[PDB]
Amino acid sequence: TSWSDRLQNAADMPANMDKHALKKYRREAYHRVFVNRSLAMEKIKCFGFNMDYTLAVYKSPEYESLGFELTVERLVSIGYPQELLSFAYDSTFPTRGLVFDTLYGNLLKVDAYGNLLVCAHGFNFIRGPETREQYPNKFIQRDDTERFYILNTLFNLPETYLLACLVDFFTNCPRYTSCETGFKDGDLFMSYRSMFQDVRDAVDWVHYKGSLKEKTVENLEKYVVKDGKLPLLLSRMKEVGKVFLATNSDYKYTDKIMTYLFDFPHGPKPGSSHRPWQSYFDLILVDARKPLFFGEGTVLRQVDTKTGKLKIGTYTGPLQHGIVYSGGSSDTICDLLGAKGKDILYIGDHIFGDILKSKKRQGWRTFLVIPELAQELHVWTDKSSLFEELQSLDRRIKKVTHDMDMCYGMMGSLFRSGSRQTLFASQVMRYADLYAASFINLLYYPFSYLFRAAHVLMPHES
Amino acid sequence: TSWSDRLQNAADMPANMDKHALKKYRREAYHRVFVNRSLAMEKIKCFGFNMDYTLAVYKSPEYESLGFELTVERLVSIGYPQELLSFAYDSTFPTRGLVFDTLYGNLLKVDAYGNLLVCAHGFNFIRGPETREQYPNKFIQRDDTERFYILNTLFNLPETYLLACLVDFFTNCPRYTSCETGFKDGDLFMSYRSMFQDVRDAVDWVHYKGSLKEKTVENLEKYVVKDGKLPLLLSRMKEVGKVFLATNSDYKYTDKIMTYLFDFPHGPKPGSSHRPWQSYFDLILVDARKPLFFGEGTVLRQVDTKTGKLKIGTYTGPLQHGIVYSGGSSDTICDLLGAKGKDILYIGDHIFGDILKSKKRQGWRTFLVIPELAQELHVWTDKSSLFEELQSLDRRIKKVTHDMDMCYGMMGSLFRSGSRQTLFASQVMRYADLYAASFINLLYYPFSYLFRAAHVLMPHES
């Protein structure tokens, strides 16, 4: 049972919009919206959405496993050895938010302060004394973005597993010699840094120039969660505010995925005429180039929707019905929709590119979708007595931590190793005002709900 | 009753080192060490200290008021009008941590997200609708360090008041015309930006080239809190670890202040021979240039203590008894003292230069000294029923906020406006593992105390 199975199960359920039925549904953790900071839903005038892994959640492990195959095939085709062809995606290995250390070739799970929670070299989990040889303070400086790359999005799950596979392969294949910073193959030296850059380029190539997009769209039911409650939520949003789409994808791919997402023999609810996906948005923006979009952006262009190409030049006109934009900046959205940052609830899956930057640069309200939450809630419930056991204790602590972490996968929970929160958890708490396994969870809260978090107090104020 | 009066009152008390007496003393909030993250004191192998506003706390309002006088006199001497001579420091106006907006000339108190809590133009406190003309989202982007300057240290209190004085003066003096971004005086235009830069340069000049240092040292009892419990704490630290001094000051000024701090007719405790301040430190480092010190630093130099000048060239030798260093980097300290970051407790007053950067770049443990805490605790206790009143309510909320804030000063508490925490409070909670009104508060905790904070839980984990 992947998280995307939980999501698709919930997606198959029709919406019961009775006030008491809604209220008891959002009792279950699966269907709750979680609050880091109070947000009064009546003050929200625009709802904005991202597409990939937000509106269009890809099925797991099938989609990761497709991207993994195509990235391997790309690497083999530029000269990596054929043995790579015998790797196969294992979803039980990668957890999201790991850090790849390009100097030494390790995947690290760290807390908000750069302290090491887990260190794996290939598939070899390194323990305290051995880690201290490479990390003498058991700490890394995350600001060293030339050395450390943070594998933040669900698109990075294939490459997280692939780096481990590759380091394991070259370490154990007797053609190569392992050195501190890479592999020697006769007179060629492959550093973990340039290996990492190859994987990163191959992933980029597969999305921009290979066959990932074509293969997804030819089998949409296989690859993409679909939910008849989406047009219902969006039309309800439109009754009280404006709705916008902002995606890093191009128009042609967005049109295919979005058409699929709305492909029901009805519109908002059973019995209603179907309407085109575009009719649900006051503003549609493609090729956004987030996070840059939240700074100086790029030039605002207009899409020619007949052909899927950009019209030539910068668009200088007003918002018109049926127009599709490309590029621009977050200011374009505020200006064309007449909104201030705090009037905007932006719903996205990318902790950095969607959530952190819209919050820090623009003061937008934020909703983080976390697809793995669908499954991590289920593990957190039926391992309560395991977390609670660890909680009491605070040697046996190291053992408890281990079997707690293992239920989630080899790299543990997305949110913690034992009693220590991950970097990713702190940034969720820090930047996401609201968060949930799915944005559909908003459907179960009334129009003007006040989401509440307890006021925060310093230690001396308590 | 300034905070420095509270501190000096506590400083006048001899140390009663009876176990039960220590224990009940640290019951009082004034004498407590507050914990943001757990810290096991037995794992600490080096204690490091900063000097200004940490070991050497300057008396308030007298020292701020001296710096204010000298900065005014500097500005008049380069051509500011003589009316400045009639400003006088008012300690009830500035709160620490304000932001000066150089575009529009406002002092702002903001939260961690850049939301506006208070906006003052000169001495005119701007309310919601008027602020929205210049701040349409009531939010500023703190990353815009060219526009916004954060007045973070206790050294900035004079200039915080001075900017307000200056904006008030030019606004109301009919020789000048007020524009959005500055003042017109015939054919001269003075922007708030270049006005701000003048004040900043004048402050710099007074510390580096004027008479602030000479006037402080000629009346040390007037300007500097002194405490016979300091050599006691430091000698106790030395029994279990190494002790180091790292200051941005030069040697000559440090020698004068430190000699004064230890000037008692005894050493660690009454009856013991006096010893030179230098004997209390394993390592003394001046001209540190923090925060840069916590990155690439500068070249390690050696002070000639006979003359107070640097010897020529880079010092390449080992740690020797009686040597005084200048410049270097935090790595110099780790290497010469044989420590890893987490073995180091660094005690400082500068949230950025001491605390944030040693934590983020190096993984040091951190103790933030907050001198105003001596007084803010006293206000927080006898206005409990005023905070608690506000707490219940959550119109009357706006009124409660106001009379809560006013008890602290015109710019409110250092930690909050009402129910909204300031930027400075969040960074304390974020970067300072421990914090107190004074580092002397450590004296009241046993050698191997475990400071405890409750493990943190996400909303879905609760």
Add this chain to the structure above:
Amino acid sequence: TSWSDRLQNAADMPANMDKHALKKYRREAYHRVFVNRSLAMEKIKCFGFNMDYTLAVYKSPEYESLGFELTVERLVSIGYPQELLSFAYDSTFPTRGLVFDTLYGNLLKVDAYGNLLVCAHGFNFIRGPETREQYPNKFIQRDDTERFYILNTLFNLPETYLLACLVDFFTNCPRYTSCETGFKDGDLFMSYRSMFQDVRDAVDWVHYKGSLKEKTVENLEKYVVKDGKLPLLLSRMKEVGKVFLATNSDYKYTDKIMTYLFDFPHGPKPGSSHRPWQSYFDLILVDARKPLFFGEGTVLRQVDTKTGKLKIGTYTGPLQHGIVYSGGSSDTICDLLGAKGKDILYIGDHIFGDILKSKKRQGWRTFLVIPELAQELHVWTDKSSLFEELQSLDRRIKKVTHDMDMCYGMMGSLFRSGSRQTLFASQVMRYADLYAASFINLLYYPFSYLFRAAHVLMPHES
């Protein structure tokens, strides 16, 4: 009669290596090597060559005209209007070395000081008073590389003509409105800057991703000058030194062009066995990335010549027989060939990327190939009495200038407008120790010839 016709005519001649025959051949200007600074050929230990427009000279106007077609077709395919399909390359318009001003959309011919010699907007040649409206000092700052792009290589001839075509088209087509800095088309604004960037991207695309390479190689006799005296020159060079190839092209394209260049039923001279092009070089380097190659370069890679792909990793081995490199830096060549800069004669066609940078950064000796020289010599000879007329005079001067310039083309000679040298001429004189219509001209000078230039004297030394 294009310059490539002159070159191919000379190429068809067999080499007569009799001492007196060589000597009288290099009497003719067509076959001379010209000297800016003295160079003693006996001190040269390595001869290095670039490939495109140096060893492999493309036929004119056919190759420019092919690149022009494909760039137009690329632009139409991303959305430029179909009328572009009716442009056709005119070789009489562009001269090499022009500057495109992206602010105002003009092509400029300038001197070494940035003074304007010619200004054309589309096909409209602007005269003094009108130019002064946009260039009030009749001068541009060439260091403003964001505004001004210098169209330096023979690869830029198509785009030089295309920019003029495009500016002429949009100016005269009544769908668009001409503004100072671009064209308005309803609510789209196309700036000359973003238009320029489109052309530049299209040219890049045609070379990297389109069909220019495939179409050249399928009709090599149509597109590329071939000369049986090339293997003769190279084998003679090899008798006295080392020979190397350094190209920005990839291996596969270099292998096709070079195989073609050596495709004769003989080797160095008639009667000798043919040998593979590779046997003529001590060192072959592809994907050089000049000019960066002359600074920090990139990582030295090794080509797999079976497949045409790079082997994985950085090459750490020595120079071996038959190995082909990719990337690296100029230091790689010095180290593997055991040369110092001044031992190296580097032969190239790119004034900046080949000549200027090897001279300034490394102290290499330089030979600039200037294909248009084949024809400009012919114009300079039979318009002697026209230059000489202008020379005497120094109103009629403006008229003489005009009909002098016109014999070369609409944008005049590559080297001057009348009595004023171009930027390109000064940089030739400044950076190219030697220069010629072809590097084959070296064949006509003995092994240890001393090329002589008169010592230079300041005005007060004369």
Add this chain to the structure above:
Amino acid sequence: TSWSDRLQNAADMPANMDKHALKKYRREAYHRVFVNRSLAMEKIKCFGFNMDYTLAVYKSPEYESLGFELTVERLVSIGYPQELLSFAYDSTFPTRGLVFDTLYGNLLKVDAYGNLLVCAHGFNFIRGPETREQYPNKFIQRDDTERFYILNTLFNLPETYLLACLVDFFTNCPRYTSCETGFKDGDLFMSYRSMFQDVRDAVDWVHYKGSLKEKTVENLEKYVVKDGKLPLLLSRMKEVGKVFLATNSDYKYTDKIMTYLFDFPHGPKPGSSHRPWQSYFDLILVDARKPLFFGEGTVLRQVDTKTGKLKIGTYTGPLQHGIVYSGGSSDTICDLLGAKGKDILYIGDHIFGDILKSKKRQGWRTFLVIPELAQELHVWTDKSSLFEELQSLDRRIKKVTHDMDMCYGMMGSLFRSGSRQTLFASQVMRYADLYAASFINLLYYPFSYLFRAAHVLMPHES
């Protein structure tokens, strides 16, 4: 006989303004204006002047020798050893335009291409084979401004000699150990780089904070060439155009030097009333900060001439009679005087800061004053048969070079070593349209003289 003796001798002569007398005076090389590019004096509408070493030429060796003393005294006062007190300025050692190599501690004389003409380590002149150990291609990359500092102005003559003195001292004093890149003194390592930076800082300190200015002004006849023909030239310029002053000095120092320069009991010519120096300029600009002045400049300020301080704020008014400016940019001058670049003749002594940058960034016409030319002309005349001997020859060549160079000093002529022009000579030829031993030489040419240089021809055009 220093060059300043030649200049002061010529300065003592009254002006004979008879047409035939002027004409035969400018026959002598001492009184000629030399032409690199043609300049029609009638097209010049503004004459601009720099002050130091242009209008105010300091006497040699006395002024260099004063700056040398004060820089030594500064270095000793921060801790350099007392032996420095026994250095004494030797004017026969330094030539202007040398390069200090901070890696190895050598002074180099180079040509325009970075080729080594002379290499001295302290006072030890290194010959070919020994130089090749540190410079294997006998070439340096001048663009490496972090390694190489070019000692371009007459203000740098003291420090050129001082670096040599210092390297000689530490090399031969047995307290220090010589390494490749500096000196070891026990546990202190002094690199040539940080030694160089000390000298540079000391020179800066002496000009900005020490006693050089005070000591010059208290003995103006000792330190500064004065010439009654200056007000005559300037008033004649004012009859046909505008005249401006632009200096890097402050107002107070400029007022003292300029008052001195005009201190005659008459104005333009004997018998005329004296007028204040300020009356000779349409525009006076101090604190120019050239070369930055020729790019974005700084904010235009107005000097308060009563006090010598800046008025507060940016000056927004027009040009008014009697106003003195500070800062600004070259555009300020063009706008306030209504000039285009080519209407401006700018007269300066700094090859980079005055001449190169006004020419390259703005298209100004340029006149370089070269005080040493007064003496180098005298050496060039009575060593004609020595240069001419070298000229014919082109072993004995190395010997001729040596005794040619020696007549100028230990570092040879400013313009050449033998038959090889220096960097400084090429930049004179490149950037200075006109040049002379003194700007007063303009007095001897009529109002509308056309200065002529022969049109330049490429080798293939000849």
